[PDB]
């Protein structure tokens, strides 16, 4: 998943891409630098649908740890409002993993509009709650 990943994922149809991309972040947990730098070859994929995939990887890497620079909110926030339903699935879910139990008012507040965003699909909602 670190050398020929573009080749590997390309043989996964949509949701397959989502899963494979997310594992990129879980392959490197507890490294907001190494993983985040191991987070620099896919997410912006020609099938940008996999963006949720690295977003889970983006959120997953921050799960179980807290960095003073608050990376999870920064990267994810710009795409939690992304119109594409799949793009958002990774955003909210990955964000939840990163700050699980943090109870941070900001992220909790930012997650607030996601609940009320009617345009969000139900699958976006279920992960959102």
């Amino acid at each position: 998943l670190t050398d020929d990943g573009n080749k590997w994922l390309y043989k996964n149809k949509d949701h397959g891409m989502l899963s494979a991309a997310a594992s990129l972040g879980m392959i490197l947990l507890w490294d907001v630098d190494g993983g985040l730098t191991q987070i620099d070859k896919y997410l912006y994929s020609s099938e940008d649908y996999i963006k949720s995939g690295a977003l889970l990887a983006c959120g997953i890497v921050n799960s179980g740890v807290r960095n003073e620079c608050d990376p999870a909110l920064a990267l994810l926030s710009d795409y939690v409002l992304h119109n594409s339903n799949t793009m958002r699935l990774g955003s909210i879910f990955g964000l939840g993993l990163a700050y699980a139990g943090s109870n941070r008012e900001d992220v909790l507040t930012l997650l607030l509009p996601v609940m009320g965003d009617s345009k969000s699909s139900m699958e976006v909602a279920g992960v959102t709650a």
């Binding site: 997410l43 983006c58 909110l73």
Partner: protein
């Protein structure tokens, strides 16, 4: 004071130095100058470092006084194998 503050930035592990190598510089020159000055002072590439600043990200199209970055604005300098924009190309290849 005097319209200036100290930026408590964070660098990555692989670039072996004081793990949190601060990034001291002015705040008036543009973000294009930011990666220029976020790289010039403490020995980084103008095009090999992104600065996720105060729970935000550098908008190097804007100056440090306008791009959301500012004085005192702490950042994790991810070891972006390419620039901030080039890891907005590299880190953004997967971002």
């Amino acid at each position: 004071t005097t319209g200036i503050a100290t930026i408590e930035v964070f660098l990555p592990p692989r670039l072996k130095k004081d793990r949190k190598n601060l990034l001291e510089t002015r705040l008036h020159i543009t973000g294009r100058e930011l990666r220029s000055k976020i790289a010039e002072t403490f020995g980084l590439q103008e095009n090999y470092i992104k600065i996720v600043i105060n729970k935000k990200q550098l908008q190097l199209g804007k100056t440090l006084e306008e791009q959301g970055v500012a004085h005192n604005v702490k950042a994790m300098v991810l070891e972006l194998k390419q620039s901030e924009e080039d890891a907005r190309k590299n880190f953004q290849l997967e971002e």
